[PDB]
Amino acid sequence: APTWFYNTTNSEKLRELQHVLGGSAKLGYLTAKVTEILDVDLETVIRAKAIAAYRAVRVPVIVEHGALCIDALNGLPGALVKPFWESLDTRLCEVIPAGQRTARARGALCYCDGRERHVLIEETEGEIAPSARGTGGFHWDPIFIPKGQTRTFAEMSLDEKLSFSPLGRLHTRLRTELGL
Amino acid sequence: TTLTLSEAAPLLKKEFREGRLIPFLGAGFSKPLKLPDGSQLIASLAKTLGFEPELFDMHGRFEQLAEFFAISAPNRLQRLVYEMSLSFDSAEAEALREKSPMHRALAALDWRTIYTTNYDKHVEGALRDAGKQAAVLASFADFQGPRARDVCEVIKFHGTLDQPDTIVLTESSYFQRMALDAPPDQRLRADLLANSFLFIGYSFSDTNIRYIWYRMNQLREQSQLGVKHSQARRCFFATHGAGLVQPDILQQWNIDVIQLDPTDKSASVARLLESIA
Amino acid sequence: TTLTLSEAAPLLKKEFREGRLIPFLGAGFSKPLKLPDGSQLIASLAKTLGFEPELFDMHGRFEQLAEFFAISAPNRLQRLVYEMSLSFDSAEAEALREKSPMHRALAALDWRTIYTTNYDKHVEGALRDAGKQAAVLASFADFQGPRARDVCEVIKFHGTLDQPDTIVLTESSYFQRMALDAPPDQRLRADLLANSFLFIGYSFSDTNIRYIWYRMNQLREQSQLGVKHSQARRCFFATHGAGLVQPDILQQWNIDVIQLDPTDKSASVARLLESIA
Amino acid sequence: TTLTLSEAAPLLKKEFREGRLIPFLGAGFSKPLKLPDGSQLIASLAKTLGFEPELFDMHGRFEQLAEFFAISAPNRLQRLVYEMSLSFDSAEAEALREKSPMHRALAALDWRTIYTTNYDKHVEGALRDAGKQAAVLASFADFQGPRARDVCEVIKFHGTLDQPDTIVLTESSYFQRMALDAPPDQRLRADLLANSFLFIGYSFSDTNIRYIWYRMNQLREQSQLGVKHSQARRCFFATHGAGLVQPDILQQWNIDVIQLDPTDKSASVARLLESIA
Amino acid sequence: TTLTLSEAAPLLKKEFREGRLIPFLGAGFSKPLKLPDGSQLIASLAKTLGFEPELFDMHGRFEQLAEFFAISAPNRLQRLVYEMSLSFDSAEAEALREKSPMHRALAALDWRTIYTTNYDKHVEGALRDAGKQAAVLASFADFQGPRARDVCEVIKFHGTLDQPDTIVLTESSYFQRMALDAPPDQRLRADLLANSFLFIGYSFSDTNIRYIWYRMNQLREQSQLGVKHSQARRCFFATHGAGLVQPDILQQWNIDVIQLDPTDKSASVARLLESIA
Amino acid sequence: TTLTLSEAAPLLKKEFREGRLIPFLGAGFSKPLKLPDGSQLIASLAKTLGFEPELFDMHGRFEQLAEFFAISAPNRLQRLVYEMSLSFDSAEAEALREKSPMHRALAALDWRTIYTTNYDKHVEGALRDAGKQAAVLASFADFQGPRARDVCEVIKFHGTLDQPDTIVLTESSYFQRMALDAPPDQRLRADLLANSFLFIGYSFSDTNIRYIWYRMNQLREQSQLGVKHSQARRCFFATHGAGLVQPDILQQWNIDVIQLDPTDKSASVARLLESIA
Amino acid sequence: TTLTLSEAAPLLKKEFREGRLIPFLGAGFSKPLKLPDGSQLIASLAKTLGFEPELFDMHGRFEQLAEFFAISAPNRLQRLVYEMSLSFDSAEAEALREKSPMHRALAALDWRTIYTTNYDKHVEGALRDAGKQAAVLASFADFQGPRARDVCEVIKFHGTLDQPDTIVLTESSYFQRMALDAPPDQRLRADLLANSFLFIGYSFSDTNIRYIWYRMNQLREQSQLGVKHSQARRCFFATHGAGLVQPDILQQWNIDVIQLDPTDKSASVARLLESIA
Ligand SMILES: O=c1nc[nH]c2c1ncn2[C@H]1C[C@H](O)[C@@H](COP(=O)(O)OP(=O)(O)OP(=O)(O)O)O1
Ligand SMILES: [Zn+2]
């Protein structure tokens, strides 16, 4: 039986974390739906998301929340990235001026055992594409190009995306600190 | 600090073959029958009173919101029992009960006493489905009534829907049971003197259940037994989602926690009841 | 459905000039002294145990989290009393207590009995500030000890910090008081037979206080008084923020709610105590 | 091993001037009024039932013979109360009560609480004879009724003849008082926490009086006081004819025996009540 | 016949760099924190009992006057611990403790064991002020509790205020420690087998401390060592005002006296603790 | 709170005719023989050492000043014993001993065991004056030596002058007796198990006498006798000038104080010993 | 009911990395060095006295047969120590000690204190073989002697062959250690207050070892800890062949039994000491 449970309602995040942390027999999976607080800071939202997901499932839980801070929007959306891609789908490439396309793709894991909340944060420098390209992946992957690379997260496979994305450095930190 | 399923299985076989294991079934045992738990009742009481169900929840505890419901109008509690009877003991809840793996695994064992705190005929009804016969005991007239010789006695600890005077739901009915003078209270305290219990689908939120296990330790500590002998007769608490505080409170009362797999709640309970056989 | 301050003022004058009004003071009465209420204690117990204070709160009720604290290590409850003594009865809490308008207005009246459920010397200390003298009664040895002739007896209902065996904080200590056999329990039930009470700064969250007012109605209903005469002797519940459910539960127990102005909590209480004079 | 009158007189002055002495009056206190004691009632119940009074006495105790009387016919207990009222509170018993030296010496002192176990208005009637005013408290409606400010409260512990539902005479009424839940029971147990009692004309034959003094020692022994401090607050038992067993049983319960002169029973009691002044 | 500060400084450096020097701190070490010594406690106990402080002093020794205080009334010792906790460990005694030069010079050294006979958190609190961490050991549960790996263990030899059962103040508690069976007694006698001690602010007035150094010489004399080798391991006794008799009594027990400058008591101690570094 | 001479006289006759009363004689019993008490010895030790007798007294207690004397020079303690023998047992102290009314009244009774803590042959010498014969037991060789059949055994508890190794005067000799292993210690603790003692002319200043009566209560309290039966066997303490603290300390140890008339010390003791006959 | 090697291995790692695990080594730890145990000594003492070794064994216990040997002739015990020195610490026992896997696995760990009850230099000699340095402490002069700063102290609990006065072998030497006053006794009782022990190659047959663990529970039971907290600090008893009675006696004293594989005694111990690393 598992001792840690990764809670997400997003079935595309589920197949990413099962691609690397899938063979760990100490990790289970839950699908409880939580409501995030209104703040652009990633550290504040992921810390209030774990206390709201432990209250739902009542087991040691691991939650995940991201950020897409943009220099042209002075850090917006930040942790408000979920309603931007709902509203501005590929017009988000158009509302940003050409010449200052730089942005940061941040991502955070927070595991709560019922007594303590520990936040792990990784981060990837990049720049917003001039137009959306690529088919693979999911939300905002056709618009983000990492630094040095020419391609998007959508144009790369799942092994190649996790060699650039924040989750590929968060697998090893979550496995080491939890013994998965 | 917590038993698993394979660790607790030889401990439950020993108490069952000696005839000293008694199941205690809660509201989570009728959850696969699509019945309300203690939270969906309050969502239904708030709709009748004109409350939003999230605003009604923050004015008091479960006992106190039902006390407020019962005194809102005359005959308001009688209507609730009628509505609960039509919903809890409906024919589609009967049909989900024969194909339920927990109720089949419960009735496959040859119990002698079963305690429940839920108002539905789905624990004795599970015994009728397996060809066995049961005897519901809820009031004083049931205990003095005629039974057969060797029949599993199902003790409806909080009452039955066909005897609406026995239902304890409001706060005043929980305070009336603090005297421990009701016939289900007197039968429970005498069975607790000699038997191990198995809590399935029940969470210790009732302050009269916790008060009975409190006062069994006042007999246990005053009897001045050793460290070895006062810890010999244990009770078992099967729960998917016990927190961090409640398992250590119950270690005082010789209650061990059996951690079940929370991914599938119904199959984890059914494998526990099949491991006793 | 709820008394205001000017409506309840002639009702409190009549019971006070007959000598049949007794104050009952809670944890909100020591809130202007910058002391913890029942929530800031749990935030301090969670820091010692290594919990975050928001995660520790969702594992049980107030009685159950203090029971978990006291059994975490040996002598863990003794340390809490020592720490509370340093922070509740400190010299800067003494200095805030002479200039507090509630404690001045309380001591200006010539009471004979005061009940409190908080562990601090700021209710009898308010009487010493006004030149009056008080008599703290908490344990069996205090009731049989010598007092003076006509001195206000302050009944520490939940215990005092200078007698750490009398403090009821954990869940096992609340269950020990359910027998209603302690000397503060026996004195309360006899004063409730003949006197009106005034609840100031107290919220009915203790299940042993609510159980005493429950069993006074079992004497009231069995005595078969009329509609007029069973509703004659009332108790009063001054509260800024009572909800929608709790005032109707307490109407059963002859407890009327006095709505105070929630903009300034300290001045609303002080105008109530000055209206009794 | 037994106090005399001159030895116990400074001990009773000290408790009286502190306001912590309460008289407890029995059936022997109304013996100079030519009233029946517990034996001449049974001689009168045997005449109604058709028994010889010596044969009726050997079939059970006092509680059990009155239980047999009350169930012999319908309305048989109501008739007894009516007959007792005409005989106990008659006008010639009133006339013997002003010239009685015990009732004059009792009313000369400024008591605050008097307990009696006899069904007659001759203890509060003695206070009305001396110009003082009394307040009879027997039922729940009396405790919540209006009194004056500083008036001696006469607690009719076993009931009054003008409220026939409060009279405890039969065995079933003594068993109903074993729960210690009646309003005279709750008032007695709280006064026993803080006061010395003086038993005059009473013999400990009631198993509910002896059970109250039993459970005050369970508070006294569990509080773990010393040898010196647990023996400090005494009660006093004035009796002409205590045997050899009963004074040593009551030493357990901090009850000292005052030996009165058995040649003249009325004058020995009157000199005790005059020595308190 | 008595060491000075400069003579004893190289003797204390040698035992400290070998890790075989242990401080023993008395009531005079908390004198710059404006706390009572053994004489101002008795002046405070005499005020409670109704004595004049000069008349109360001539009826017995320090152990015997506190024994008389504790048996004057029930719960009289518990109140003293509560009062001492609020006066000894107050916030203004904390503020005098960071700017005290003795407590800074004590915590600057890297000790491993510190013994104290005073009831205050100002010796381990001095170690917390310097960024170091300490471990208070007073009762049996502290010795078996978890500590860290290399942390200075502060042995509260006479007890701590947060564990009121460990405080030895009365005469009966000193006689209970004559068996040398308490966990601080057993730890002291094993550390005395191998280590030099430094007595600072302590005067040998406790007859259980003097009895431990007595029975170490009964091991020393029975082992039949020479004149040279039995005098090798010394203990040190820093005192401003030792008399003419007491330094020669302690030469029997291998205790050397370090004469400090009596003009400024606090600066003389601080220069001794800085000379060890 | 203190027995007089006429009150204690029938209590001492009962224990004497049962053979269960044993006298314990102190230094005040040899005061009419013009001998030094514990203060005039120290005035004589200060003259030898070159001290003024008022300055020598303020450097330590009685045990500690004699320890300082014995280590001032070699053979200094032996000289003191020789000097004491010439002064205490002189021929003019013999002549004052036949005409002493206390020593005549002591020897007139037929004792079986007498304990003394003074170094003089005036207690067994009083028995030789009355024609009786005594047996001095001080060392191990005396207990195993031959006696006669029924002869009063005088136990020199602190030693005798004709056996100078048995004298306990210095502090190191009192610490050697804290093990309670000496033959007078073992004989005292067995006689205390079964007999009442009468302390005459002795003040409880020896911390080894007080420690023996301490540890008899540790047997008394652990045996869990009642309040009545643990207080049955008393000891008696005849003293002209006991203070206000010491009689209440000794009530713990079942020691009652007999107040003698302080105007004439010798005649008050003699009337006590004649009242036993 | 008995730990295995893999179960006890994480329990021993936790106590070792905290520095709170101390080995206790017996006579079975020197069995692979071809040395006598407690039975082959008696076979050698019987040859000297002229007994057959099977007839000499049935006249008393091990302590009593060595007491009979030592008093058979003058200087008979001195010769035994000389003979044991030649055979226990011989050069061929040194050569078996470097290639012994138990002594290599013992010295590979970084201990701070090791207790032994055998008279041979093969426990500190194992530490010298691994390049480490040890400090043998057997007598009073060793504890007060100079050591280095951080060196494993080997406590020869029963004595060493190079100090023949410290060897306890005869019955009179075991009775002299019942006072628990020797320097190895005082050091053991203070280390037992705070540390877990690991008994390797030792069987509890010494009545002074069993008496020390007896009196640690008298401190444990009088401290009134809970069921959970009094069972927290355990000791460990590695034994190939413990019977059926002795493991249940030692559960009283918080001693758990580690069952080792009895087929190869030396390899089972070595795998235990390697699992701690
Ligand atoms: O690494 C990523 N690579 C591509 N897209 C990502 C990533 N990480 C988040 N995203 C998208 C998903 C979602 O549209 C939004 C985060 O919002 P988020 O609240 O976490 O998604 P959710 O509520 O549907 O699932 P969950 O219950 O786990 O929070 O940005
Ligand atoms: Zn989301």
What would the DSSP string read from start to end of C141-203? HHHSS---SS-EEEEESS-BTTBGGG---SHHHHHHTTT--SHHHHHHHHHTTT-EEEEES--
For residue G257, the 8-state DSSP code is E
Resolution of this structure in Å? 3.0
Q: How far is residue G257's CA from residue G249's CA, in Å, rounded to a whole number?
A: 11
In contact, C86 and E84? CB cutoff 8 Å? no
In contact, C118 and C25? CB cutoff 8 Å? yes
Q: How far is residue G155's CA from residue G137's CA, in Å, rounded to a whole number?
A: 5
Count of D–E CB contacts within 8 Å? 7
DSSP string for D4-50: -HHHHHHHHHHHHHTT-EEEEE-GGGGGGGT---HHHHHHHHHHHHT
Start-to-end C-alpha separation, chain D: 25
E runs forming strands in A96-177: 102-112, 117-128, 144-146
Chains that touch E (3 or more CB pairs under 8 A): C, D, F, G
Q: How far is residue D241's CA from residue D260's CA, in Å, rounded to a whole number?
A: 8
Q: State whether residue B263 sits within 8 Å of chain A by CB.
A: yes
Radius of gyration for the alpha carbons in chain D, expressed in angstroms and rounded: 19
Name the CA dihedral angle for G132, G135, G138, G141, rounded to a multiple of 10 degrees.
Answer: 170
Query: How many Cβ atoms from other residues are within 10 Å of residue A8's Cβ?
Result: 21
Q: How far is residue G259's CA from residue D186's CA, in Å, rounded to a whole number?
A: 62
Q: How far is residue G258's CA from residue G266's CA, in Å, rounded to a whole number?
A: 15
For residue A138, the 8-state DSSP code is S
Q: How far is A43 from chain B (nearest CA, A)?
A: 25
Q: What are phi and psi of F230, to 5 degrees?
A: -75, -15
Q: CB-based contacts of A84: which residues, under 8 Å, 6+ apart?
A: A68, A77, A92
Q: How far is residue A71's CA from residue B67's CA, in Å, rounded to a whole number?
A: 57
Nearest by Cα to E126 from E154, E155, E159: E154
Cis peptide before A77 (omega within 30 of 0): yes
Q: CB-based contacts of E33: which residues, under 8 Å, 6+ apart?
A: E93, E96, E97, E100, E120, E122
Q: Identify the nearest ligand to the CA of A170 by its number.
A: 1
Start-to-end C-alpha separation, chain E: 25
Burial class of residue B45, CB neighbours in 10 A (0-12, 13-18, 19+): buried
Q: CB-based contacts of F220: which residues, under 8 Å, 6+ apart?
A: F230, F254
Q: State whether residue C253 sits within 8 Å of chain B by CB.
A: no
Nearest by Cα to G165 from G175, G153, G174, G173: G173
Q: How far is residue F48's CA from residue F42's CA, in Å, rounded to a whole number?
A: 10
Q: What are phi and psi of B71, to 5 degrees?
A: -110, 15
Q: CB-based contacts of G137: which residues, under 8 Å, 6+ apart?
A: G143, G153, G154, G155, G156, G183, G184, G187
Q: Where are the alpha helices (DSSP H) in chain D?
A: 5-17, 38-49, 53-56, 62-70, 76-88, 91-98, 101-107, 124-129, 140-143, 171-176, 183-191, 209-222, 246-250, 265-276
Q: How far is residue B50's CA from residue B56's CA, in Å, rounded to a whole number?
A: 9
Chains A and G lie in contact, requiring 3 or more CB pairs less than 8 Å apart: no
| Ligand 1 pocket check for A13: Cβ under 6 Å | yes
Separation in Å, CA G217 to CA F213, G213, G223, G231: 27, 7, 9, 11
Q: CB-based contacts of B225: which residues, under 8 Å, 6+ apart?
A: none
Q: CB-based contacts of A96: which residues, under 8 Å, 6+ apart?
A: A70, A72, A73, A128
Biggest alpha carbon–alpha carbon distance for chain A = 52
Nearest by Cα to G84 from G35, G135, G148, G147: G35
Q: How far is residue C40's CA from residue C84's CA, in Å, rounded to a whole number?
A: 12
The single-letter code of the amino acid at F267 is A
Q: How far is residue G253's CA from residue B213's CA, in Å, rounded to a whole number?
A: 29
Across the interface, do D194 and C143 touch by the CB < 8 Å criterion?
yes
CA G47, G52, G57, G60 dihedral sign is negative
- Tell the residue number behind the tokens 């263990």, with chain if given: E153
Chains B and F lie in contact, requiring 3 or more CB pairs less than 8 Å apart: no
Q: How far is B32 from chain C (nearest CA, A)?
A: 25
Q: How far is residue C271's CA from residue C236's CA, in Å, rounded to a whole number?
A: 15
E runs forming strands in B182-275: 196-200, 235-239, 255-259
CA A132, A134, A140, A145 dihedral sign is negative
Which residues on adjacent β-strands are paired with residue E197? E22
| Ligand 1 pocket check for A16: Cβ under 6 Å | no
Q: How far is residue C42's CA from residue F111's CA, in Å, rounded to a whole number?
A: 70
In contact, A33 and A4? CB cutoff 8 Å? no
Separation in Å, CA B133 to CA B22, B151, D38: 17, 6, 57
CB contacts, 8 Å: G225 with chain C: 74
In contact, B174 and B190? CB cutoff 8 Å? no
Q: How far is residue A108's CA from residue A98's CA, in Å, rounded to a whole number?
A: 29
In contact, B207 and B214? CB cutoff 8 Å? no
Q: How far is residue C202's CA from residue C210's CA, in Å, rounded to a whole number?
A: 12
Q: How far is residue G177's CA from residue G185's CA, in Å, rounded to a whole number?
A: 8
Biggest alpha carbon–alpha carbon distance for chain G = 57
- Tell the residue number behind the tokens 């008739």, with chain if given: D79
Secondary structure (3-state) at G9? helix
Query: What token pair was written down for E216?
Result: 């170490």
Q: How far is residue D161's CA from residue F228's CA, in Å, rounded to a whole number?
A: 43
CB contacts, 8 Å: G146 with chain E: 18
- Tell the residue number behind the tokens 């006053």, with chain if given: G181
Beta strands at A102-112 and A117-128: parallel, antiparallel or unpaired? antiparallel
Which residues on adjacent β-strands are paired with residue F236? F198, F256
Q: State whether residue B210 sits within 8 Å of chain C by CB.
A: yes
Query: How many Cβ atoms from other residues are within 10 Å of residue A139's Cβ?
Result: 17
Q: What are phi and psi of B210, to 5 degrees?
A: -65, -30
Q: How far is residue E41's CA from residue E47's CA, in Å, rounded to a whole number?
A: 10
Beta strands at A117-128 and A144-146: parallel, antiparallel or unpaired? antiparallel
Q: Which helix (H) or strand (E) holds F47?
A: helix F38-49
SS3 of chain E: the string is: CCECHHHHHHHHHHHHHCCCEEEEECHHHHHHHCCCCHHHHHHHHHHHHCCCHHHHHHHCCHHHHHHHHHCCCCCHHHHHHHHHHHHHCCHHHHHHHHCCHHHHHHHCCCCCEEEECCCCCCCHHHHHHCCCCEEEECCHHHHCCCCCCCCEEEEECCCECCEHHHCCCCHHHHHHCCCCCCHHHHHHHHHCCCCEEEEECCCCCCCCHHHHHHHHHHHHHHCCCCCCCCCCCCEEEEECCCCCCHHHHHHHHCEEEEECCCCCHHHHHHHHHHHHC
Q: How far is residue G34's CA from residue G31's CA, in Å, rounded to a whole number?
A: 5
Q: State whether residue D225 sits within 8 Å of chain E by CB.
A: yes
Most E CBs within 10 A among C34, C71, C79, C82, hence the mutation to make, goes to C82
Q: How far is residue A93's CA from residue G93's CA, in Å, rounded to a whole number?
A: 85
Secondary structure (3-state) at F256? strand
Query: What token pair was written down for B235?
Result: 């009770």
Q: State whether residue G149 sits within 8 Å of chain B by CB.
A: no
CA F252 and chain centroid, separation: 20
Burial class of residue D184, CB neighbours in 10 A (0-12, 13-18, 19+): buried
Secondary structure (3-state) at G181? coil
| Structural method | cryo-EM
For residue D232, the 8-state DSSP code is S
For residue G192, the 8-state DSSP code is T
Which residues on adjacent β-strands are paired with residue F22? F197
Separation in Å, CA G252 to CA G25, G215, G231: 21, 12, 10
Query: How many Cβ atoms from other residues are within 10 Å of residue E129's Cβ?
Result: 17
Q: State whether residue E55 sits within 8 Å of chain G by CB.
A: no
Across the interface, do F244 and E59 touch by the CB < 8 Å criterion?
yes
**Ligand 1 centre distance from Cα of residue C213 (Å):** 53
Provide the b/e sequence for D253-277 (b: ≥16 CB within 10 Å). bbbbbbbbeeeebeebbbbbbeebe
Separation in Å, CA C26 to CA B276, C237, G12: 51, 11, 51
- Tell the residue number behind the tokens 């009897």, with chain if given: B223
| Ligand 1 pocket check for A9: Cβ under 6 Å | yes
Q: How far is residue G189's CA from residue D126's CA, in Å, rounded to a whole number?
A: 75
Q: How far is residue B236's CA from residue G22's CA, in Å, rounded to a whole number?
A: 37
Query: What token pair was written down for C265?
Result: 């909590």
Q: State whether residue C68 sits within 8 Å of chain A by CB.
A: no
Question: Which ligand 1 atom sits nearest the alpha carbon of residue A33?
Answer: 27
Q: How far is residue F178's CA from residue F168's CA, in Å, rounded to a whole number?
A: 12
Q: How far is D188 from chain C (nearest CA, A)?
A: 8
Q: How far is residue D214's CA from residue D208's CA, in Å, rounded to a whole number?
A: 10
Query: What token pair was written down for F197?
Result: 């003692």
Secondary structure (3-state) at A67? strand
Query: What token pair was written down for F185?
Result: 């210690």
CA E164 and chain centroid, separation: 18
Which residues on adjacent β-strands are paired with residue D259? D239
Beta strands at D255-259 and D134-137: parallel, antiparallel or unpaired? unpaired
Q: What are phi and psi of A127, to 5 degrees?
A: -155, 145
| Ligand 1 pocket check for A8: Cβ under 6 Å | yes
Radius of gyration for the alpha carbons in chain F, expressed in angstroms and rounded: 19
- Tell the residue number behind the tokens 């760099």, with chain if given: E17
Q: Which helix (H) or strand (E) holds D259?
A: strand D255-259
SS3 of B22-37: the string is: EEEECHHHHHHHCCCC
Question: For helices C38-49 and C62-70, what crossing angle results, to 10°?
Answer: 30
Separation in Å, CA D81 to CA D119, D267, F109: 9, 31, 71
Q: How far is residue F218's CA from residue F96's CA, in Å, rounded to a whole number?
A: 43
In contact, G167 and G159? CB cutoff 8 Å? yes
Q: State whether residue D233 sits within 8 Å of chain C by CB.
A: yes
Q: How far is residue E125's CA from residue C250's CA, in Å, rounded to a whole number?
A: 50
Nearest by Cα to B30 from B149, B155, B121, B113: B121
Q: How far is residue B68's CA from residue C245's CA, in Å, rounded to a whole number?
A: 6
Q: How far is residue A153's CA from residue A145's CA, in Å, rounded to a whole number?
A: 7
Nearest by Cα to D62 from D43, D86, D82: D43
Query: What token pair was written down for F130?
Result: 């009355």
- Residue having the nearest C-alpha atom to atom 22 of ligand 1: A10
Query: What token pair was written down for E9?
Result: 């400084």
Nearest by Cα to E115 from E46, E183, E33: E183
DSSP string for C218-256: HHHHHTT--TTTTTSS-EEEEES---SSHHHHHGGGTEE
Q: How far is residue G277's CA from residue C132's CA, in Å, rounded to a whole number?
A: 70
- Tell the residue number behind the tokens 């250690």, with chain if given: G177
Secondary structure (3-state) at B214? helix
The CB-side HSE value for B5 (13 A sphere, CA atoms) comes to 16
The single-letter code of the amino acid at E163 is Q
Radius of gyration for the alpha carbons in chain E, expressed in angstroms and rounded: 19
Q: CB-based contacts of E86: which residues, under 8 Å, 6+ apart?
A: C85, C86, C89, C90
DSSP string for F84-129: HHHHHT-HHHHHHHHS-HHHHHHHTS--SEEEE-SSSSSSHHHHHH
Chains B and G lie in contact, requiring 3 or more CB pairs less than 8 Å apart: yes
Query: What token pair was written down for B24?
Result: 């205690």
Secondary structure (3-state) at A7? strand
CA D38, D39, D40, D42 dihedral sign is positive
Which residues on adjacent β-strands are paired with residue C160? C163
In contact, A174 and A134? CB cutoff 8 Å? no
